[PDB]
């Protein structure tokens, strides 16, 4: 008080000193149920693939791509990534996901990698240098053990032109060893650009169905359309916290109310265009919003000449969120309530006044 008044001797009265404010302790994050899951189930166990070189591309759109099912299963065999860090895929949003898939054998899994080129570098699907993604190749010898050795996934081999990143090697050009073109069926040094499958289950361990679903990522200037789910904290009530709802962000308490919103109504606003009500994202409960307790601090002093003890008056604040006596204008901490009525000496508010009487102590 002496610092604010710039003096050493003050007289009787109530002086304004400062303005206190309660700070939020913790923060609460609330998000609704995780719905609209990305249909990644039909990518692994589904119908057969078209061909090796004729692989099908499946783009990704607005969905919830949960990664808690990819690196948490045992049906697969290879999960080697190339700088993806699957432990943090839930907190990373991408825009372009390439769900390439084709059929290979057990010995061709090694030849398909950005660090090991060769047979699959210019004859089939090639991998780029960066290749932000993980290879998903599992042993498909569960029910792909048909008799006769059906050769339908004929992969194109001995091709001259190198294959481009994320492309297909579709070219009906016969293999020419460096002579006149035959333009027929295996003429003068001619070979049809097709190789015969037929890796029967009684052929070998390396020659088995190993359908691989290549997965990669790519970032662009477009907004994030595909990303993993989010987390959610526990609900707290009757405490000045910082709520972090899906559409709302601010501070204030979160108590219960008797208001009833419409099925589609989610937010809540008052006449002064201020947020005062919020709906719970997970459950169905209208949570009231009320700003935390604030206000200025006032002191009641009887003058430094008589004595030096003073009191405090937190105006407009309840005595729980801060001897103590709840008045109609705050909580006068540092004074006793006497039933005897006297003349008003120091005005406080709503009729209550203070004075320095008898042992000497501030009375209200």
């Amino acid at each position, epitope marked *: 008080t002496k610092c604010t008044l710039k003096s050493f001797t003050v007289e009787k009265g109530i002086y304004q000193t400062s303005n206190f404010r309660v700070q939020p302790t913790e923060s609460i994050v609330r998000f609704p149920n995780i719905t609209n899951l990305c249909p990644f189930g039909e990518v692994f166990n589904a119908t057969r693939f078209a061909s090796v070189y004729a692989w099908n591309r499946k783009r990704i759109s607005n969905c919830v791509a949960d990664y808690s099912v990819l690196y948490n299963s045992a049906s697969f065999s290879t999960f080697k990534c190339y700088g993806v860090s*699957p432990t943090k895929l839930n907190d990373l949003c991408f825009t372009n996901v390439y769900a390439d898939s084709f059929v290979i054998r057990g010995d061709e*899994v090694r030849q398909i990698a950005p660090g*090991q080129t060769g047979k699959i570098a210019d004859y089939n699907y090639k991998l780029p240098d960066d290749f932000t993604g993980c290879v998903i190749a599992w042993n498909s010898n569960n029910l792909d053990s048909k008799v006769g050795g059906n050769y339908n996934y004929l992969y194109r081999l001995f091709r001259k032109s190198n294959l481009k990143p994320f492309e297909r090697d579709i070219s009906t050009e016969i293999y020419q060893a460096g002579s006149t073109p035959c333009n027929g069926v295996e003429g003068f040094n001619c070979y049809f650009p097709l190789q015969s499958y037929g890796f029967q289950p009684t052929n070998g361990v390396g020659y088995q169905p190993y359908r691989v679903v290549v997965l990669s990522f790519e970032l662009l200037h477009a907004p994030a359309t595909v990303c993993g789910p989010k987390k959610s904290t526990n609900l707290v009530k009757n405490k000045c916290v910082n709520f972090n709802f899906n559409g709302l962000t601010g501070t204030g308490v979160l108590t219960e109310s008797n208001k009833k919103f419409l099925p589609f109504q989610q937010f809540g606003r008052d006449i002064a265009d201020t947020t005062d009500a919020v709906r719970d994202p997970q459950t169905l409960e209208i949570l009231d919003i009320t700003p935390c307790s604030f206000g200025g601090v006032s002191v009641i002093t009887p003058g430094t000449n008589t004595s030096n003890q003073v009191a405090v008056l937190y105006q407009g604040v309840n005595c729980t969120e801060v001897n103590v006596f709840q008045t109609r204008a705050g909580c006068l901490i540092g004074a006793e309530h006497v039933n005897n009525s006297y003349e008003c000496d120091i005005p406080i508010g709503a009729g209550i006044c203070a004075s320095y009487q008898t042992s000497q102590s501030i009375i209200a």
Partner: antibody
Amino acid sequence: EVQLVQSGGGLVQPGGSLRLSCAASGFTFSSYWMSWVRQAPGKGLEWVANINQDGGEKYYVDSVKGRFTISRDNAKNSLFLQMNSVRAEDTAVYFCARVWYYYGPRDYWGQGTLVTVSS
Amino acid sequence: IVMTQPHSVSESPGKTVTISCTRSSGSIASNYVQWYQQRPGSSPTTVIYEDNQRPSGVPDRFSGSIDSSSNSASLTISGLKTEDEADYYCQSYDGSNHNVVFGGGTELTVLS
């Protein structure tokens, strides 16, 4: 923050066995796999068996396939490993460690159980 | 399937000496490679996992690379001091029958 403990055996004998219990606490024991790894005196590490979330699948190795029973109660957050017909080469210290993900390492290991067979 | 590893190795505080771990079947670039450290008289701990990267807490001196020449791996442990004299193991998921194969161990010590 994660501090795992395990006990439930100080001495065994051929024929009569016990059940090792690994108390899971600290972290969230509802989204991680579990597996046992034993260590023989003067040797390296050996993978004993694995276990699913609650009751999905119980993967065993071909060495102890038929004489070891693993279990996991997701309700009380505990890991039980009961033995039966202990052989002679089973003299090794068993360790309890949670699995971050099926294609990753183990985050926190246990403390070790001195389980030895001696006449 | 078995994971080969040198039995013992010793040197003086100075340059780094990597530890090799050569496989026997399959490919090394098909799964991750982890390196554990077991202090004598306590429980093992993970030092480096996904050798292309490194976790927090452990100093950046412990490095490792991938050698796809003959399905092997290397753990270039730099900064040989007294607080690093311990044992190390090799581990890599190779078994298609849901089996985790481990290494043999090492005896990396110092010269004092």
